[PDB]
Design an enzyme around this catalytic site. Sequence first.
Site: not given
Lengths: 50, 117, 100, 1131
Positions: D758-761, D899
């Site tokens: 989550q949160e761009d991971s 990314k």
Amino acid sequence: LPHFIKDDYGPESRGFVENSYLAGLTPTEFFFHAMGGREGLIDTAVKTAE
Amino acid sequence: PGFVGIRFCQECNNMLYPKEDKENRILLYACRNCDYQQEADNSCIYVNKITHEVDELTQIIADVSQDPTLPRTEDHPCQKCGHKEAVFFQSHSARAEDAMRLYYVCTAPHCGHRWTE
Amino acid sequence: VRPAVVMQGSARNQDDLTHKLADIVKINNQLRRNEQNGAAAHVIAEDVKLLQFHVATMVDNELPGLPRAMQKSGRPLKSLKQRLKGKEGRVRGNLMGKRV
Amino acid sequence: DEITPDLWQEACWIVISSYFDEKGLVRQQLDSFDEFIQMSVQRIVEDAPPIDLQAPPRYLLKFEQIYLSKPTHWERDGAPSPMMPNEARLRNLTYSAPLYVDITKTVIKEGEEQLQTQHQKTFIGKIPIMLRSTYCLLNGLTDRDLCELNECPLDPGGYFIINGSEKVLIAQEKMATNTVYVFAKKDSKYAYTGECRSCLENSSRPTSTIWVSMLARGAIGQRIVATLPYIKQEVPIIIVFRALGFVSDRDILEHIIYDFEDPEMMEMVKPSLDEAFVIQEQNVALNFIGSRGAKPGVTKEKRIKYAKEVLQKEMLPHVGVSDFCETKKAYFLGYMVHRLLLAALGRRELDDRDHYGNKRLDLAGPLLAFLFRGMFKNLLKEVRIYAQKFIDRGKDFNLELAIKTRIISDGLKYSLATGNWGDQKKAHQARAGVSQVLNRLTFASTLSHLRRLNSPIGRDGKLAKPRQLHNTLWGMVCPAETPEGHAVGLVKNLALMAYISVGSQPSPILEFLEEWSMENLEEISPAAIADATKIFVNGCWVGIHKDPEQLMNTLRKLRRQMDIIVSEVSMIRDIREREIRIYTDAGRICRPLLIVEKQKLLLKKRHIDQLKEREYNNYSWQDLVASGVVEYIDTLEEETVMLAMTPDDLQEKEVAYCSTYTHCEIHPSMILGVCASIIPFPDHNQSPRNTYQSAMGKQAMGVYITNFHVRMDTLAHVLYYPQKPLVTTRSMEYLRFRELPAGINSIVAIASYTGYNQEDSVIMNRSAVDRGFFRSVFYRSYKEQESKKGFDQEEVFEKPTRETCQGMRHAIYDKLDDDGLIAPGVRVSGDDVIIGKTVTLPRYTKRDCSTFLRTSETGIVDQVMVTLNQEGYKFCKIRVRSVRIPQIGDKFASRHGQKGTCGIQYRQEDMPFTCEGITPDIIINPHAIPSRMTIGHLIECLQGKVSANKGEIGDATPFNDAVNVQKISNLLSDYGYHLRGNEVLYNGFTGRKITSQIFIGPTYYQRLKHMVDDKIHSRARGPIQILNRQPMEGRSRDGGLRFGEMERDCQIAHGAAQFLRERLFEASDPYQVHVCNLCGIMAIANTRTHTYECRGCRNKTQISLVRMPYACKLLFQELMSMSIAPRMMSV
DNA sequence: GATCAAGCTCAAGTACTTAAGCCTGGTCTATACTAGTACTGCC
Ligand SMILES: [Zn+2]
Ligand SMILES: [Zn+2]
Ligand SMILES: [Zn+2]
């Protein structure tokens, strides 16, 4: 853009992207969208200092 | 009315300034360098067109018909020669807010006719 | 306040303030001898002018109109004013915010 | 004969391939340096004035010709030997060639005792050479010769080597010269200002800027003035015209206003005339100028001469600096006033400062030429002083001893080394940022850096106008590639087919124009300028013409026939203003385009046929241009050009849009740059995403160059198993991304799994990583040398010993050899010693100055190299290797700005799986798609699944109607998969199906150099600075984190006063001082002998201890240094 | 009663201070003229 004619105020010439992302953007639409993105990037990178 | 043109001296080719013959009360254009004088013929020394009633047809030139980036149309033929094709463009000139008016030019060679709808 | 740190090698490098005080003492001694012995007072004058410029540039280098006190490579000296002027200074750079 | 629409897609790319097979990617850099070596240097040498020196005998010292040999190196024995670029990179040399100039010294004394002395090939200095240029040793060598020479055939060159460091000159933007630009500043005393940065065609680089402004309406009328150079006071134009020898007001108006039938023009010029009429002679006007000149007018005679020479040399030098050209200068200044009047009356539009047709790119050529000119001037200066102080003694002097070759050599070296473009002392007049270190992190980064532009607007400026993507950047610059920091829009990148003009002489064009009906400017009468068409050449008004239509048609036919006019020449015919601007200047960014004659392309099928058999019939892009099928159009001519996006636009439609096209695009994707060309389906992503990808492709790991084992780079990342992208754009074939890829095709599944992405991971497959998925190696090179700076102390490589060396750290020195250098294959950890160096002193007679590893590196020594530097001292380079396995915290990014850091690594047994045994190598969070609108990412994953199942490479060229999502879905439905890429997955922990059919497929991911091992940092009572006893700065120094002002404010809001005190006082620089209770000044305390006294007050009993930060004590001492008495009153 | 001189007020011009935070790497560091300072052949 050079692709258009002078005194052209049509939506395409003035940067109305009629295509969706999934559909894909024509090159002119792409360039105009890039212009808008540039505007956003500059605002983001400028407001910070003030 | 029309504008007022500059008058130049015939000896030193300098500008003639307006002046009045105090004795005869007549307008003269006299040179500020030598002693030349001329009898005025318009009686007007200044005109400022604040409303800016400019006819852009005089600014347009027939050579604009050779511009390939300009749009062409067949709906407005030339009245001076009858040619069908004609380029049309806006005023695009500052000091003219109502610039959406279209100005047409005949694409025929040697015609160069200009007009407006 | 002006630690003489060693450069990459072994020669002891002096601080900017040390170099400025050295210049001040040079012109001060010169003027002192020029007043101890009659020096026509012209040199005394010029000397006082140079001493004033050195004392000024020691505490404040950003002098409007006057030339910036230069050092090696032509860089301006870091006057005491520049040491605590603003960001990265003593007040904002070492007292309000500091490494921990 | 005509290329049909079905064959167009192949024909255009054939043409593009021929272009990149002939020009290349750094052609502008190579051509700029070439033109500098063949023309600029020789021209500067001829342009220098012969220094006449005399006591009587006299000497002229005239230079006549130059010679630049190949790069060579002289050892201490002095034998000239050829130096390879690899040898320079290894020995930290400077890849330069000697410049030999022929000198002629003529002695003339008396009695007809005249004689010439010729000094052939006098060594004037060394010039660094651009790799792969004409003079580089790698010129014309085959790929096999380069491989034998340990050079990469893919290395494009275009950079220098200074002290072994690869330096690349960034193209600097500047406003065009010799052109009139009428602007209007909103807040100024002037309404309109027509300026002209004037400069000699090929000399006098300082661009004398001349302004011709109009006073704001706010007085009888609006006055016109001129801010001439070397004059600090504005001067009305009429005085300038009279000072030029045109005294009659009629003559002045004939030079300014070409149509006396324009009473508006007369009425607009009248105020300046009425304001400047008391002067009526040339001498009086010149005296006026001399009185306004910066130089004091000690005598009217000198004053007048001062002016006369200023108006002859400084005012509009591009028009001419010789005598009797006052007519030409008067005509040009008149045209400048005419332009100012047209702008003031609104009949013309103000000039746009951002229009790139009004800008020029200063490349390596003109930049090195500017430096060489200034430095050659300094050289002639030193030679002048030397010869003067020798002839003053009544004796001859030797030019070999006068010529300080170190000036040119060390000057070019310093400028290209530091970037300060200018004199070594003029560190403030010089502009930094030029000649940056070439980025060698990946081939795309290298190419972008070699194709980088720079706008000297200043990052501090907050105006968005120069940062905006102007319309004129179409095809000339990449709209996506630009940094997102404090340099947005300022640092640009050339487009693929963009070529910056190199420059050319206008003499042949001028001869052709004169040969035709053009009339020179001095031959005509002002009455003929009204209806006639003006003709400018490089901004110089040369004459007028009568039929500009057929004139332009002729000039175009010549350029299309590679006749007198070369292809780089621009020819813009403004029709409304009746002018023909011709340009041969350098820095004019231009691009190729297909000529369209009627509504049909000149690129017939026979051309595509010949370009297909390009390897046999040697028919190249040059032959295609010479055939008049292609034309180089610059930004300024694009205004007068009508492009056809594709041949489809040339067909007859139900409603004709243009029907008068004159050029056509080779392929619209050419508008993208290098780092943007690698993006698949960039026309399906939001532009910010394309920009972030253009910025990260340069940070992606890969194989930055083939001879990376030979290069001893300071920082290098190599990926174990690079792969070419399954979904490739047709431009990668020219970027050579297939040969030096920078990523791996990963089976990515867009799903929410255990919320560890989550949160761009992202979630990685531990088993894939165990099989070498995204595994990489990090190479770090440490350099050191033994300096014999003096007999007092000498450095030497030798294994230190406890009984002789003094400053030996507690680390063990056993890993070293008796030579003092570690051996390859040795395991080294942080703080370990790798170079054992000792320096003799004036535990005795020698101090340890060994080179240790950077802290927390933990690598293995890859190789060790030993050689001699320029000074012939021993020089070692140690390349340490560290294998970096992708772990939690490493950044990975797709080609769409997606990314993210690896949130967690699950094993193949714990990852979800399809009906077949396919677990996703990576799992990304679906929430990263909607806000970012990276539809190109999903289309890439789909085209990738189809490419992997079909056995081909998906074509993700940006603008390609032959590939859409419906076609891709149908192809995917043909292989037994859901047409939309979704697939049934099973929970790896429980085996249960997942209610939501997950989207999964191959997507090309990249690993970025930003690993967590290089960023993790901690500190607890480590080292401190010297001036203030506060922690150091940086991981390399074991520094501490900064508890800034914003943090202090936050803790104030929290009200944690004890915490704020611990952070700002007790954890940074706790200190104690002794103060006098009377004067509050820091007393002299001696705890050893328990004595505390204040010398001022003469007391030694009323002393108190104070707990203050050391920085506070230092501040108070710095105040006492400024005579301020901060008295610490403790009561 | 009018004119001139002095004082007060207002406007324009010039000069001085500030421009987000923290965090990671890299490279580079004065000529230039000079007198003395020793060496070393030359005699
Ligand atoms: Zn007259
Ligand atoms: Zn007609
Ligand atoms: Zn005291």
